[PDB]
Amino acid sequence: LTLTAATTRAQELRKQLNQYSHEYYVKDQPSVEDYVYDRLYKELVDIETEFPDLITPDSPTQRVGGKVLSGFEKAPHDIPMYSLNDGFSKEDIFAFDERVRKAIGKPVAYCCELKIDGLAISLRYENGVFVRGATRGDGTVGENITENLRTVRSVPMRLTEPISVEVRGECYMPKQSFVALNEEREENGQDIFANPRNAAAGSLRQLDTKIVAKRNLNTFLYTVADFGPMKAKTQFEALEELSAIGFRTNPERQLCQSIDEVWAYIEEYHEKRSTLPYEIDGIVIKVNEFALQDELGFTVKAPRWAIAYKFP
Ligand SMILES: CC(C)(C)c1nc(NCCc2c[nH]cn2)c2cc(C(N)=O)c(N)nc2n1
Numbered sequence: 107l108t109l110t111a112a113t114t115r116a117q118e119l120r121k122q123l124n125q126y127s128h129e130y131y132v133k134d135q136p137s138v139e140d141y142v143y144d145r146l147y148k149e150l151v152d153i154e155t156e157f158p159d160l161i162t163p164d165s166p167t168q169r170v171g172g173k174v175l176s177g178f179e180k181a182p183h184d185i186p187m188y189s190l191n192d193g194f195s196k197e198d199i200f201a202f203d204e205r206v207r208k209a210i211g212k213p214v215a216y217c218c219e220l221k222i223d224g225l226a227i228s229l230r231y232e233n234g235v236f237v238r239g240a241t242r243g244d245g246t247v248g249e250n251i252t253e254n255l256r257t258v259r260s261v262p263m264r265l266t267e268p269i270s271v272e273v274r275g276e277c278y279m280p281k282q283s284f285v286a287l288n289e290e291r292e293e294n295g296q297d298i299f300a301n302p303r304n305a306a307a308g309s310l311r312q313l314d315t316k317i318v319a320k321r322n323l324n325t326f327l328y329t330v331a332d333f334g335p336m337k338a339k340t341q342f343e344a345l346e347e348l349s350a351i352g353f354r355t356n357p358e359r360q361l362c363q364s365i366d367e368v369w370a371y372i373e374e375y376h377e378k379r380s381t382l383p384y385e386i387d388g389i390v391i392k393v394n395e396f397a398l399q400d401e402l403g404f405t406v407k408a409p410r411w412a413i414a415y416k417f418p
């Protein structure tokens with residue numbers, strides 16, 4: 107195979123393999139059998155092995171990692187990553203709704219989402235290319251964990267549309283992976299992680315990306331730092347749009363027109379809790395209309411337009 111032929115073929119393979127990866131990791135619904143992906147993946151590895159200059163950032167072979175950092179550079183969030191206000195009872199939730207109606211002056215719809223137990227992350231894309239991955243940190247300054255996030259399979263290295271946007275969401279470790287990891291640590295005389303949240307946080311703190319690539323971390327994106335590039339006008343629309351551009355979103359969301367529907371949602375997933383492949387510590391209730399979120403604003407700690415109902 108000539109360099110000229112390999113150059114063209116490599117792009118074809120990346121394109122095809124990344125589409126399969128999108129279906130498998132982002133949609134959780136593969137179209138082809140694994141052996142189909144494996145054969146094409148092997149073909150690409152052979153090409154890259156022969157002509158290493160053909161290796162690119164969006165090549166699926168880079169998911170295994172390789173870089174080892176000495177430490178993490180600071181990662182500023184010019185648009186702050188606020189925290190969430192907490193609610194602990196049906197009372198707190200209805201009180202929240204009352205305060206929201208009092209401020210807005212009319213009934214308001216809420217986009218309800220599961221509160222994934224993990225770590226909040228921020229992903230920056232420029233012209234569709236993944237350029238920065240960061241932890242929330244203290245809200246205004248986090249850690250630059252770009253290299254580690256390159257190994258997180260559900261994180262796209264190149265979006266289909268060449269858009270420049272910074273999306274945010276949760277990075278977590280599914281229950282099964284958490285269990286297996288702790289067994290592995292027990293086998294190697296290491297301290298186990300107390301919970302999936304800690305396992306995810308500890309994994310993203312590792313400096314050797316090759317180790318992180320093996321931690322089986324996953325994601326659920328739920329917001330955008332700057333809605334400039336995007337068209338969504340409500341949170342529910344934002345979730346659909348995040349999915350449209352290539353990110354993994356949680357399918358269990360629900361738009362509720364009343365606080366009673368909100369409470370019904372909470373009860374529904376409070377029972378379905380144990381059945382999910384990931385842990386959740388509550389429900390996040392968000393004023394759906396962005397125009398109303400803007401009107402409500404933020405306290406110093408968090409937005410006034412959202413509240414997290416924490417499971418007892
Ligand atoms: C954007 C707001 C403030 C309303 C928000 N903050 C969360 N956490 C605090 C940090 C942060 C700032 N920017 C991105 N994250 C959320 C965590 C979850 C979850 N744990 O699943 C969720 N579904 N939604 C969340 N929504």
Ligand SMILES: NC(=O)c1ccc[n+]([C@@H]2O[C@H](COP(=O)(O)O)[C@@H](O)[C@H]2O)c1
Pocket residue numbers: 126127129130131136137138139140141143144147166169259
């Ligand atoms: N069927 C598919 O579309 C698809 C896509 C990505 C990974 N996989 C499988 O995931 C596993 C890990 O492969 P990667 O580390 O290359 O992501 C393999 O068993 C592979 O076959 C399958």
